[PDB]
Amino acid sequence: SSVVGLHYKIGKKIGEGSFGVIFEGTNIINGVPVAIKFEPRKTEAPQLRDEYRTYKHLQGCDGIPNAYYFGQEGLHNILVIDLLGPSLEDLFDWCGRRFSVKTVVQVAIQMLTLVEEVHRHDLIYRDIKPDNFLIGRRGATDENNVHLIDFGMAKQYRDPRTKQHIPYREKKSLSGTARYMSINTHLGREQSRRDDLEALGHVFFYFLRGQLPWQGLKAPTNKQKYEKIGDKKRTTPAVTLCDGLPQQFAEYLDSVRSLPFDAEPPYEEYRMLLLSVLDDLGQACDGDMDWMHLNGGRGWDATINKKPN
Numbered sequence: 001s002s003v004v005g006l007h008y009k010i011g012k013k014i015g016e017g018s019f020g021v022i023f024e025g026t027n028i029i030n031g032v033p034v035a036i037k038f039e040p041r042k043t044e045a046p047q048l049r050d051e052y053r054t055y056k057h058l059q060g061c062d063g064i065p066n067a068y069y070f071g072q073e074g075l076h077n078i079l080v081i082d083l084l085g086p087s088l089e090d091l092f093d094w095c096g097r098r099f100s101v102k103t104v105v106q107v108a109i110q111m112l113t114l115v116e117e118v119h120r121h122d123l124i125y126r127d128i129k130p131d132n133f134l135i136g137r138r139g140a141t142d143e144n145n146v147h148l149i150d151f152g153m154a155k156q157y158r159d160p161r162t163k164q165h166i167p168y169r170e171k172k173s174l175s176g177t178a179r180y181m182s183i184n185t186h187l188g189r190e191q192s193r194r195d196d197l198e199a200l201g202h203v204f205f206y207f208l209r210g211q212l213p214w215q216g217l218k219a220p221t222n223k224q225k226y227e228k229i230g231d232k233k234r235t236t237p238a239v240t241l242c243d244g245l246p247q248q249f250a251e252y253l254d255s256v257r258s259l260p261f262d263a264e265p266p267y268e269e270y271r272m273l274l275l276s277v278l279d280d281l282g283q284a285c286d287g288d289m290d291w292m293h294l295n296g297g298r299g300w301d302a303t304i305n306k307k308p309n
């Protein structure tokens with residue numbers, strides 16, 4: 001049958017890189033579009049169910065899609081959430097692999113708020129990358145707001161009742177994305193709130209510069225390449241990353257790298273710090289984003305942009 005979870009008609013495939021295939025779909029009661037993820041039920045790393053629980057735990061958070069359904073059908077488990085738009089990596093690419101200072105500040109404070117809400121719900125994200133932050137759909141009220149998906153790497157960092165932080169430990173696996181992950185992650189250290197925010201700082205410099213200086217490194221093995229990347233991170237001062245850029249971005253990176261393991265980050269201080277960039281430059285925080293000017297003011301286009309995607 002073409003309909004799963006009673007109410008969701010399967011449409012075209014829209015990717016498969018995480019655990020399972022992802023499809024578009026439509027709610028056959030109201031026509032609202034959805035994203036549908038399939039996980040093979042006979043898998044040794046069951047993950048979809050825990051992701052449904054994470055979405056349900058974050059229900060009501062701005063920028064976190066609703067999960068409408070989870071169930072088993074045939075040989076698959078199925079999860080259904082809101083359908084969103086292109087990722088920030090997509091939009092970055094279509095804007096020529098550089099975002100303006102204003103667009104970086106504006107997405108940064110939204111990304112800080114998203115990660116803050118994750119943290120307030122006792123979770124760390126552990127897979128920060130521009131590919132997992134998505135905008136909305138064309139014409140929607142949240143068309144150009146930033147959203148966060150893919151919680152397969154998320155983990156509880158504190159007991160929900162007592163707020164007791166997990167213990168520090170080392171010899172952790174190097175799971176994550178080497179371009180953005182924190183220095184602590186390279187060193188096999190248990191991640192905490194500070195590591196999500198340091199990865200954000202790397203993403204901010206990536207958007208501003210167009211590249212990070214630890215891209216393009218060579219080594220015979222993935223393990224040795226990750227190590228060289230971590231080495232480069234440890235030997236590149238934030239003011240060097242920030243050459244010719246507003247120094248608030250260096251101050252942010254140094255700050256979150258200095259956070260104690262169990263410390264609560266001052267999220268609003270960080271947001272005010274980056275907002276002061278716009279004051280310095282005489283700009284307004286008015287929601288105008290680089291990608292809104294693509295294609296003559298029309299916005300991103302499926303055959304000009306998303307087809308090279």
Ligand SMILES: Cc1ccc(-c2n[nH]cc2-c2ccnc3ccccc23)nc1
Pocket residue numbers: 014015018022035036037079080081082083084085149150
């Ligand atoms: C159940 C479920 C469905 C999808 C996803 C997902 N994973 N990565 C990106 C998306 C994703 C989410 C929402 N709208 C999209 C639109 C286009 C491309 C990807 C997405 N996760 C869980």
Ligand SMILES: [Cl-]
Pocket residue numbers: 221223224
């Ligand atoms: Cl090796």
